[PDB]
Design a protein around this ligand. Sequence first.
Ligand code: HEC
Ligand code: HEC
Ligand code: HEC
Ligand code: HEC
Ligand code: HEC
Ligand code: HEC
Ligand code: HEC
Ligand code: HEC
Ligand code: HEC
Ligand code: HEC
Ligand code: HEC
Ligand code: HEC
Lengths: 497, 497, 497
Amino acid sequence: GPTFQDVASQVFGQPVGPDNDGTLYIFGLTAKYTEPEYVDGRGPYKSFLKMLPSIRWYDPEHYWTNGSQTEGVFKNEECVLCHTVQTPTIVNDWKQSSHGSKDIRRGIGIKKDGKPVEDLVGCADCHGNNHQKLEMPTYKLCNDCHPKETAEHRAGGLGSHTHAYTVNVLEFSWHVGKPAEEVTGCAHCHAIAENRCSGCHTRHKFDPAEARKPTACRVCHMGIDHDEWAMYNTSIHGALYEAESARMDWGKKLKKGNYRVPTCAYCHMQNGDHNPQRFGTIYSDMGMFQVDRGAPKHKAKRDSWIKLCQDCHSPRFAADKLKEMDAGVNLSFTKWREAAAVIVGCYLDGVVDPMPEGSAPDWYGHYTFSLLPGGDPRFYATSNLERLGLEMICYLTGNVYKAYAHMSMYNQTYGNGSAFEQDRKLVEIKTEAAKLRRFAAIEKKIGLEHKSADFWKHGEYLDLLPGWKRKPGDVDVEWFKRTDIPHRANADAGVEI
Amino acid sequence: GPTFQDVASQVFGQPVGPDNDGTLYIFGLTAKYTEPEYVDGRGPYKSFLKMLPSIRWYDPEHYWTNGSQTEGVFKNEECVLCHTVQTPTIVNDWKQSSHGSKDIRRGIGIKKDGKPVEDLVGCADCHGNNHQKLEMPTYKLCNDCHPKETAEHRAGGLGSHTHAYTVNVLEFSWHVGKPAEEVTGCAHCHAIAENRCSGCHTRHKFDPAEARKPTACRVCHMGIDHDEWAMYNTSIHGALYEAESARMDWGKKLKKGNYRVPTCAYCHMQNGDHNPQRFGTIYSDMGMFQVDRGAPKHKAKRDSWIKLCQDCHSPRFAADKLKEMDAGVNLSFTKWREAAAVIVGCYLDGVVDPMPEGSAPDWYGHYTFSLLPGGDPRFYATSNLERLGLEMICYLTGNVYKAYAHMSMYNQTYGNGSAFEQDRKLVEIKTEAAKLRRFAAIEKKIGLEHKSADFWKHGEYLDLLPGWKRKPGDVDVEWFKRTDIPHRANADAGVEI
Amino acid sequence: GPTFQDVASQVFGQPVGPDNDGTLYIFGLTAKYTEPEYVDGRGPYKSFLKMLPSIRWYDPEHYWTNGSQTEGVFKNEECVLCHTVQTPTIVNDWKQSSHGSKDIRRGIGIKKDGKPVEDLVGCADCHGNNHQKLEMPTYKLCNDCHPKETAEHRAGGLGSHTHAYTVNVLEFSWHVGKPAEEVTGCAHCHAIAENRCSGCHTRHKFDPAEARKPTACRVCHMGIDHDEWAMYNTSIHGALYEAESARMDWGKKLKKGNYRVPTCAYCHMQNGDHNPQRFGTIYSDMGMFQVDRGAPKHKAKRDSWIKLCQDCHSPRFAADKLKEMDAGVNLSFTKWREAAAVIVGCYLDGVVDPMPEGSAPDWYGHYTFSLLPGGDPRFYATSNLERLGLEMICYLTGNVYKAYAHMSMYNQTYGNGSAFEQDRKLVEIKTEAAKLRRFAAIEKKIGLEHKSADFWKHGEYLDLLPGWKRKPGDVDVEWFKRTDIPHRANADAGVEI
Ligand code: HEC
Ligand code: HEC
Ligand code: HEC
Ligand code: HEC
Ligand code: HEC
Ligand code: HEC
Ligand code: HEC
Ligand code: HEC
Ligand code: HEC
Ligand code: HEC
Ligand code: HEC
Ligand code: HEC
């Protein structure tokens, strides 16, 4: 047959053409997908992983090249004079930073190669002197003068800023399983957290006072799968932050007695610690793994949290609130286990439409049920039942923990990522399960041989997925053998981990 | 058969265990639900209602006990010196309050037992002197020195702060029908509103200027069933609040001419009135009950609102806006009545899956259709059709009123709790109704005897519901006989009301 | 049969009555819809289009009449003295404006009829002197003294403020297809943008500093079909705006070097240009039409945007970010084209329930499939399949463009209006398609003659739609013949356009 584009073209009277030629396609009906220019992605799936070339800014050690048209070797004060015209805000930021202004320096005692840094730290000191060999830095630059903050930034485990990109982008199913341009933001968000020092105190002011605000975290720590910004913002702490932000002193260091209202940085970067993951009781895959943080074996962590709350509360009150979290989280997993039983039950009875063999292969190249061991739990290229299952465990159950951890009365109960949203999801899942069972029971009785539709398996998007290209020997298992970084438990890792 | 936990345990290789032992359960699959320690709940369902012990902070008259390890009888200045170390922000707050600072006092003329309060009001004056008999106060303390504000705080009817917990937690189906730990936030949110004086001007600063901001209300007045924060925030008033908050004078009293931008407190706590419910035309169960507030019988209320708007507008303009609300609300109920007709029609024809007898009993212990008289309208432990019905009347139709009342052009039409969301919900409900009817018509013709799945009735969560435990003589009807408080019209009340 | 109201009345014991009599109807069950008082709407559908009378404030040239009870001809200083009592904030605003205060004037050189305006511009100068002939102005007043800003405000094409109401309310299907009171906010939002000069710098302060903030745009530029506020707010620009709003100098003019953080006005009202649409590459029906803005034919626009970003960035970085937008948008249309193929496929096979003839006629008066040429793509009064289709193209695919254009890493990928939301919608659409196909295949095999339910066609709301009233010769085609305004491509336009 002819393409969907060809039919639509003859109906709307617009010719079929490539999507990238500048034509304004009516509802994008007659445009054909073209493959963007890619560069090869890194990690264990490097044989087929792709990035857009703009990865140069975020993993510059491996991708950065000269792309400037301006030639010359310059001195710091020449960088400033020309960029005052060419990129004025970069200079205005830098002039308002300690790097570019001695007047706002605090005599911290910054050293490079054992010697005190008493001059201005200018454009050339961070980027180089030669305009045809300009450098785009990572934390490795900052380490030259700020080793303490850098060592802590690099001290986290899996699930922290430290391995956000190197492990949790390059090894992650939802990233490696999709066309590169669909998930550019994933690479960049996670890479900004890992490879940069500007995620909280932005360039070029590098102002710690900015870093202390919730705005230093919420661009990443938000949304459907980890809604801690909204949980915080809908707690009484969050409301007080909004009430007091304009007039409170953000210049004070994060320490006991310096703040009325706690922020993300206050509780998680306690006393300026740049390894914010370490105060957490235990890594729980964003609350998808169940754990009672109030159990005897986690007493030192619970006591540490109680003492943190004791900056501004009774410890009895804090201990009660954290016990409410434990109880609320444990109740929330009963609804997930119900949902799981219903979903896997449909699979075992063979009533799921489509069954795994009726869909496009998963990112491993397998036709495996997503909510079984070895499968890829997901929201795309799968059945409605499986999608609703992923949404139950990831979007809702994990966020119930976040709602309790951040004292959002509403989002624990009624709101986004709450108990009542779990209820409603559970009804959806049972509804989908009942539909599937009634169709199968009818089709059996009348002897109708049901075959799942082709649109579950093929389509313009589904045909782009890398699951189709997967073959034996396409995994770089040496990557997974590495012990200097942790790893995800991928089904095709091929080694221990 | 063996449990879901037992199967999952043998598949993932993690042993089955209690949820509360500290083990990190893989997707919470092999964890068993344990019942948290409870204390008995109050109200008409006290025979089985439970609370977590942390209810001590929110209903302290009935639950507060000594839990301190520090001994001694102290004087105010000793409270301050030690707490300066132990809970520094409480002291910093108190020092910045009128209670703890004579310099910021306004000479209001506060009296206790007829005599002027000219000293500092310290920790011991509110909490007691003996550290083993410390008191956790309610409005009953505040009444000693602030009788006007307390009398107004206690002057509201059902649906106000005055009875938020005593009636609308202890008598409410969605609270009494669920395990206590699932709805801790409900008890606390509603109890903070009723029993405390810190919901708007927080402890320990007790700053009225903080209370005047929308942040004093939005932690409670938000979300899917009452989205007035979002309605306000997406009106031009809300945008102007965000624009002017940082530089406007919040120190001015709530009165005509003192503010450009109106806030929740400005319109609802008119002239500092602590009974904000009373300016409302009529209680309407969060807009779930239809009423034309522009009808001749509500003229005094409509005129009062028009005059409130006239602080900053033409009364003709205000009268027009409030007429738009009346018209928009009346249009919105046509979609609800359509939806109701479709839903109850499915019930009358017996095509709802599950039918009420196929689900777990409701919180009364009955197998009754949720959208009939005597039933419990809900979003959980019920059919998809009934869930979608509850969402239509409560989440959407009630919020259309809120969108119009707060001048949110977008949320009246496109947005959350809008006309267009009602449309989309109505399509969902008709869709569910059509599916149910087509399955029933097929099953009838081929003689398939459909029985609703067991997962509608039993499951790890569904088995915890109190509907199973309900028996004759388990209601404290003496509670419902009380005339000093209003009551909800519960089906098992047993008395008049 | 008797009405739904009559049945409910006999069950709840509340009498049937009109919705507008002031009665508090229990769940609005026994209330009857009454038609509000209307005035005739303007435009090509004037034969049946209606507005509420409050349209007087928003299209005053055609609807404004005297409605004051105060008589007299007054001088400016008499307006102020009385309104200081009657509408105090209007006077307080005006006193704080350049119109009412010479001290804050900047010597701009404002002229009327060629002569300098050196006096105060008072109430009477904008509204008239006679209190029984008071005027409610449009931009036509402002033009007297501010011709530059007015000429630019009137310079936009279709899709801009310039024709928001005159074309995109009066000619739009979703407005003309619904009862007037349901879409009052649509008329007003779009009319405020077109006919007023107070949408960004509100009356009566008319402060440009207020206009520069994102709060000057977000009340309109938000939500499910155009979520640029949320896209901006969840970018690092948005977080920095929230961090710096309170202490930054909003008094500075929108120009290169005056701001660290860019706002809507900064990027779209470049250098104070009051035709913000013109910087856009090409109008794309809110991103529903596909276009590669990085193609050679759009180089001048892409270069202009790169140079705008170069106020604060490298142009290489800006060029890369805008290329990511192009790639991300082009990937997003593959999912829409899949969805479209599935949806129209169901129509061609005749398995859509209801089919177009089973629903109420569309707003043209036709029984036409909404996602075919000549149809009306919509979310209401249509099938679930068609609703989900509209949601795919309008709410999601169009917002992917908005997410990329505003650098929201999260909303490009996980969040509202993202790639992953498209995925989940695509699964919903395929799910609905599979249900429809399985019902049709079963019904065919057993010889069951399915007729779509009556609730798809009739109901209390559906019966109000103007599709029922449409007849030949009810379109004012002379309107569509006009060349001084652009037009929408409506199926019943009757002329070229
Ligand atoms: C040495 C050559 C430097 C390099 C390389 C970087 N920084 Fe720096 N930094 C340097 C000095 C001498 C100081 C001032 C110390 C003082 O006495 O005040 C700073 C300070 C900062 C700060 C704090 C700024 C503030 O206003 O308080 C930050 C947040 C900071 N520096 C960040 C930082 C980053 C992220 C770097 C890598 C990109 C980096 N600096 C490198 C000297 C040097
Ligand atoms: C102190 C009052 C808090 C504030 C303010 C914020 N968070 Fe928090 N968070 C807090 C606790 C007590 C916990 C649970 C830790 C435990 O082990 O008991 C959390 C947890 C999180 C997490 C998950 C960490 C993990 O699972 O180990 C994240 C990602 C997180 N918090 C984010 C976060 C952000 C971005 C904040 C500002 C919006 C924020 N938190 C503030 C307590 C406190
Ligand atoms: C958020 C998660 C951050 C990231 C990532 C990094 N920094 Fe940071 N920094 C952050 C905060 C909230 C503050 C204030 C902490 C406080 O105690 O109040 C800081 C501060 C700094 C400083 C100033 C240190 C001083 O002695 O005053 C420096 C020099 C600094 N940060 C360095 C730095 C570098 C090199 C980082 C990456 C390599 C980096 N920070 C990341 C928050 C966050
Ligand atoms: C920034 C805007 C984000 C985007 C875009 C996505 N991710 Fe993310 N992710 C982000 C945060 C702040 C969190 C931590 C939440 C916490 O409570 O820990 C995460 C976490 C993950 C994980 C862990 C999943 C699990 O094992 O539990 C991974 C593997 C992950 N994120 C990867 C990732 C990818 C590749 C994304 C799109 C393909 C995705 N994230 C989007 C922040 C952001
Ligand atoms: C008497 C022994 C007191 C009791 C008990 C409580 N308060 Fe009080 N309050 C008291 C004084 C003498 C004043 C100052 C009056 C003056 O001249 O200014 C106050 C003031 C307040 C205020 C206003 C604070 C402000 O800065 O404007 C508030 C909001 C307040 N008080 C609250 C309040 C609450 C909630 C109480 C119970 C918990 C309470 N007070 C008790 C004296 C006394
Ligand atoms: C004045 C300009 C208002 C502002 C600012 C806020 N609200 Fe409001 N609200 C206002 C009106 C005219 C109405 C309808 C009253 C009527 O009888 O006509 C409402 C109503 C509510 C309600 C429901 C009250 C009831 O049904 O009786 C609530 C719960 C409410 N408003 C909450 C609320 C909050 C929290 C506000 C700030 C975010 C807010 N309102 C501001 C007018 C005004
Ligand atoms: C929100 C709903 C509030 C609750 C609950 C209570 N208060 Fe309040 N209070 C509130 C506001 C918005 C303000 C300012 C009002 C104004 O006119 O601008 C106040 C103020 C007070 C004061 C100061 C009174 C004075 O004469 O200046 C007091 C003493 C006070 N409030 C007492 C108080 C107590 C005792 C309450 C509970 C028992 C209480 N308030 C609750 C908002 C709200
Ligand atoms: C604070 C964060 C809340 C949570 C948690 C829940 N409720 Fe609530 N509720 C809250 C407000 C501000 C409103 C008033 C809205 C208005 O327009 O009136 C309500 C209202 C109710 C009602 C009335 C229902 C009806 O009769 O119309 C009740 C009975 C109720 N709320 C109870 C309640 C319970 C027990 C909750 C969880 C089990 C629930 N609420 C959550 C604020 C908050
Ligand atoms: C002439 C009779 C006027 C008419 C009619 C309107 N405006 Fe005006 N405006 C006028 C003067 C003399 C000035 C001050 C010029 C100066 O020297 O400063 C203004 C200024 C404004 C501004 C800027 C205000 C600021 O504080 O910077 C705005 C935003 C403005 N005017 C808006 C405006 C609108 C929307 C009008 C129609 C409703 C309007 N003006 C009419 C004189 C005159
Ligand atoms: C500069 C940094 C931006 C800021 C800040 C805001 N927007 Fe934007 N927007 C920007 C670009 C580069 C684009 C794409 C233009 C192109 O042709 O490449 C957009 C587009 C929009 C649109 C659609 C315009 C069109 O399709 O022609 C709208 C409606 C829009 N932006 C709204 C908007 C608002 C309200 C903003 C503040 C919240 C905002 N933008 C800020 C870049 C920038
Ligand atoms: C938002 C889309 C706006 C609308 C609609 C109109 N104005 Fe505006 N105005 C807007 C901004 C963001 C600013 C500041 C621009 C800057 O360069 O920083 C302004 C400013 C004005 C001014 C002051 C001009 C001066 O010389 O200082 C005037 C006189 C003014 N605007 C007039 C005006 C009128 C007459 C409009 C409608 C007819 C109007 N503006 C609409 C934003 C927006
Ligand atoms: C203000 C609160 C709005 C409401 C209410 C509705 N509309 Fe709107 N609309 C608004 C904006 C800011 C945008 C521009 C988005 C951009 O990226 O261009 C629009 C756009 C439209 C369109 C164009 C549709 C298309 O051809 O692509 C029209 C025809 C339209 N809006 C009409 C309209 C009507 C009549 C509404 C309810 C019936 C509706 N809008 C609500 C802002 C707002």
